[PDB]
Design a protein around this ligand. Sequence first.
Ligand code: ZN
Ligand code: ZN
Lengths: 139, 137, 6, 6
Amino acid sequence: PTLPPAWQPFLKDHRISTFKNWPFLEGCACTPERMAEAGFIHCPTENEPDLAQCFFCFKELEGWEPDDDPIEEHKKHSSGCAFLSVKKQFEELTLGEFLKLDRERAKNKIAKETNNKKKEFEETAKKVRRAIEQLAAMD
Amino acid sequence: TLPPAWQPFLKDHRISTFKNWPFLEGCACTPERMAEAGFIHCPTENEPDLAQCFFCFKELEGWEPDDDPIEEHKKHSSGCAFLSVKKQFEELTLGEFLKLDRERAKNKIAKETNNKKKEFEETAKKVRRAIEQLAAM
Amino acid sequence: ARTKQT
Amino acid sequence: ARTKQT
Ligand SMILES: [Zn+2]
Ligand SMILES: [Zn+2]
């Protein structure tokens, strides 16, 4: 209401709130506060119940261990992510700055969708190619 | 790009609201100038030049070509915070922006309330008159 | 200009 | 942690 849904993930408090059933709490370095401070949203599936995604660059990481530092993991796995460079707090950004960042996020989202479609297409290509080789082979 | 509720903060949105504005080039109250002053175009059947500040909700009709929209806004609604905003939109911090939208939200409620007052006072006049007529004969 | 009436 | 798979 006060901020549009599509922009809520920019907010730490929103992000923390996504961690309804995170296994790692007090005593662990990767607590929800720390995951959220690093950009991660919680995306648990059947197969991967610890799945986390950067809201900004869309990198997905599973297999969290208690001693994992979310910032170092984000730096390691997705070094190019602009969000890691944002030193200012949200209220302190200028709208130009904020709009610039949301453009970059939109480009990141497209890049991710695109890279996905590519890999899915390449896999379909492999199937079809195989099927056609088999037929030439029988022949 | 930006949520509907917040578009009126943007000059280009505001200008766009002037679909059939009589005062064009050569006039002091052009759409660019109206928009720079905070006005949105709200034409009715009865008042086709009706303009409203998007921020303080002041409504002004009866525009004349030499009218400077900023001086009209200053005159008619002296306390409107929007007139204090010197910075361009992109240059505001989100805190600054969110502060302004809170104030606008209050302004809107203040206005709705002032409206309901006037409507209530008008019904009171009607009811008073009815009772007089009934008490008379 | 001036203040909407009615 | 490591990247998602499949
Ligand atoms: Zn990231
Ligand atoms: Zn105003």
